[PDB]
């Protein structure tokens, strides 16, 4: 049975997007919050219709379609997709993902009936990635320096944000974050990381080490 | 059957962490509240992704891994773990605890299917201890 | 009225696109005629700097979102 | 003479292409050397706006007809 | 036996294209008139060489090739094409459609000998569609 | 039979290192030239003794030892090393690699007798990597910009040099080089790469595309 | 038995490429000179690593791969390739041409052992054509 | 009183450690609470040069003797 | 004589290290006594700024190359 | 039966350490003198408590623990240790060496009862080596 999202939460999220913008970490946290339960294409479509303006909504429709197409390519590349089935009769077409298939157009109840939970979570992750792309597009990691007065956790937050919300492949983010911790992060912390008796091979480990041995001031 | 946590509660908890910080007793009480029912690795992972910033989230992933490794050492030190079974075929690997095992990666429904209640409570206690460590470390 | 919408001399492009998409989708056109109309209104409205920017597109833009992305990339920062 | 043909500052591109193809095909070149010469004359003549338009072609144009189509699509309406 | 089109009709059609343009309905009607009987690749090629300028002729060669390629894709998608035969030995290659096959290059008599009527009508329809495309593109 | 390297070539290489430095691309090319045939530990040791000063020579001995130790760890991790044999009696100890084993200390003829060609090429590659490390150490990729008047091949050469001669892991160099091509390389080439109808997933492909469609000037 | 090229000749060729450029006829003549005997993938790879800069070396790796792929397509189109054999067990894979096959990675002696003379001359001609392409492309 | 002991600007570190360990062991604390108190007093007293020297310890020092040895090794000779 | 080598007030550290390693390796010491002597000469020569820089090393340096690398990293640029 | 060391000798040794220092050869000779008969952990512990200051005493406790751990590693590496026995029930734990085992904590009489002569001489040699280390470290 389909239950709609509260218009009160949607109104609060819309005003959050209106005042803070699309890219603020609080806005992305709120979107992740309202993106907790797997939503039907109807829900996400109406949500983006309400919270986004017309032009960002067009951009988001484009990006969502592209991400869903990548998902369907991965699905035809692996018959063990949680949206797919074992036989060929359960293969998931883009009409079923975008809610355009038969028995789904405009009807959220029938949508919730025929859709799979794997389908729902794939649609939801696709919509979240598309929202991230459009937010990064509507309004550079290698230009980030730790200010003379800035703390280290703020610098790490800013750097990880800019590196993960960029055009790098997923397998190239951790080495870049590490090598940016080592070369940025003004020479006191640079020497603190350099003289590490242990080898730090993860951004979390570097952050923990620096937070332990940092110069309290 | 898997039911997600309310995004309203998650938004309220995120704003609590944003205003009060990670170490306030009210924040730890709220986390204990949202840590009441045994959560699947998917739930806790997304929860920490939403409520924590990027750097605290990295620290928390590290600490959670370490605590889960201690749990798995205690599990191989005692075949009577509520996550383990009696035979050797029920021994619980870290891929099954972190949600990385087969049939679980990215799918919360399959996760809830294959996981044990002892597995869930162990994962939950590990995540709570890791949150405590990171909160004590961040400030 | 959608056919009377022009991009003002001082107006940005995202505001013009928002206004145009709003007026086109909230009108009496069939659903299958909105995207071509939005594209052809981007091409003929949207004062001649952006008109020439869209005209000299080495790729073929076949969607309002793609046109918006291209224009936002290559727009004259001012 | 084909090697003396330039696109005038005010001349359109289809007139220039007509004149150039006429002078190249009605000349002393072998039949198998007309298309490469027409292409390389499109690239080096055809005043620098169209020169840069052909240079920045995401696709590789390997025929005078394809070059003409591309330029007619992405030309600066004026 | 191959019979050429009258140079008087071709001259009148060329002057029509010169004064009225490529896109006028009278010009398209005249082209449809001179496109009544199924023409051999030689005929259509020389006709477009005479009535069209150099640049429109290049565009038309491109468009004609593309349309013939679509026709050959439909032909390999259906063995019952009026240009095809039942066995695999009658499959029609683009060298036979564009007049480039063996025994046809430059010779209209041999062309008319080896070509099928279905081949001729397909070539003719392809050339007409290509002319329409180029006319819509030129102005 | 062992043949020594010409002292004329060694003198020319030493003067090259003296005038151009350790890190110039011409110096590295000359070292690669004199590093063409597989050298015995005696040859490389004397070569580095002659061309390098005392302190760079100490640094190079350290780095060479570390790289040889990594090689021996990989060798004990794979019994199919071209330096190893099939049985356990052919396992290669560091005394045999550094030329310290029995029948080799100070004698290049005996060295050439007992050493394997795989041993020689491994020693040579180790010495080359150690030279690169010491050269990078004796005298920043994220600060490299394409100058307003600089050509693109010079910028690409400089960037690839600084990225490969840095502290990044080997699996993180290509994504970093690509993302630096995209964000550096002044906005004309930035837009040229952005509007690529094909997806460029390799620095070589990006370089080829840009060289094809660049604005001749 | 594998014999390396003289570093003196390689240094002279590198300085020739440095002063005259990639496209001068003297440079191509010198490359043809050092491309006289059939080289192993190790030799050509190190030679191009030394004489070419980083970006031309990337371009050359790309072009060499493409040309070797064309060679392997011609090889699967003709079982009488001097690199191939008569039976199917001698078919030459790109791992064997690029030196990536088993028993060849990093070892020039084993390379020279398993490689065929036809393989060597095909690799050499491919590398020469790739060098020509990159030289025509760089300037 | 142990909680009032500071390392003077001119005092050496071994004298400060002697005084602090004396005052902590000759006090009313339980025996199981002396080592943590001595460590945390080394870290917060012992004027900021030695404070930063102990803070930036690549190893974890978990004993007053180890802290004393480390500081005596890496101290600023003056 | 190696035991008479001092780092001059204006001399850089790499020149001093070169001179010292040269004089120590080209002397009458056994081969197994050169590294400890070079280290202990780095520590006691090499005027008190670098002396204190080596003294306050959070890590233990057990090789002339490691000492040289550390000093080159943390040296006072001047 | 346990007999304590004379407080007169201990006072003289303490004043020797106070005037001559920890590293003088006369001080080491005096320590060797008072280290002649195998001492119980109680004796050596109180001796070092009296003759050494607080910080050298902490250093000495550390060094003594490390040396005793090396001894116990050698003991588990050889079942023929004069402190060990033949069966596994006589294996000597660090609680028995440091005097922390059951029936020994604070009681020198029970200590002397349960301890072996090999245990005593090993403890004594360990304490002497630890004293040497701390003396070399303090100045």
From Swiss-Prot, chains C, D, H, I:
Cellular localisation: Virion
Lineage: superkingdom: Viruses
Residues annotated as transmembrane: none
Marked site positions, Involved in capsid protein dimerization upon acidification: 28, 40
Job of this protein: Self-associates to form the irregular polyhedron core composed of hexamers and pentamers, that encapsulates the genomic RNA-nucleocapsid complex. Assembles as a tube in vitro. Binds to inositol hexakisphosphate (IP6), which allows the assembly of the polyhedral capsid.
Assembly, per entry: Homodimer. Homomultimer. Homohexamer.
Name of this chain's protein: Capsid protein p27, alternate cleaved 1
Organism: Rous sarcoma virus subgroup C (strain Prague)
Residues shown, of full length: 391 to 468 of 701
């Amino acid at each position: 049975a389909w239950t709609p999202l509260e218009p009160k939460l949607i109104t609060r999220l819309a005003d959050t997007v209106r005042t803070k913008g699309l890219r603020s970490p609080i806005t992305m946290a709120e979107v992740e919050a309202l993106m907790s339960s797997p939503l039907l294409p109807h829900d996400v479509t109406n949500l983006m219709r309400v919270i986004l303006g017309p032009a960002p909504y067009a951009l988001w429709m484009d990006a969502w379609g592209v991400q869903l197409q990548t998902v369907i390519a991965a699905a035809t590349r692996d018959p063990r997709h949680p949206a797919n089935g074992q036989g060929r009769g359960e293969r998931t077409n883009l009409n079923r993902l975008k809610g355009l298939a038969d028995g789904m157009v405009g009807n959220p109840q029938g949508q919730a009936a025929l859709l799979r939970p794997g389908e729902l979570v794939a649609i939801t992750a696709s919509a979240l990635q598309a929202f991230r792309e459009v937010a990064r597009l509507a309004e550079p990691w290698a230009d980030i320096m730790q200010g003379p007065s800035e703390s280290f956790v703020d610098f790490a937050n800013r750097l990880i944000k800019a590196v993960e919300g960029s055009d790098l492949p997923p397998s190239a983010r951790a080495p870049v974050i590490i090598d940016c911790f080592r070369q940025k992060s003004q020479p006191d912390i640079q020497q603190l990381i350099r003289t590490a008796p242990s080898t730090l091979t993860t951004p979390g480990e570097i952050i923990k080490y620096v937070l332990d041995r940092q110069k309290t001031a």
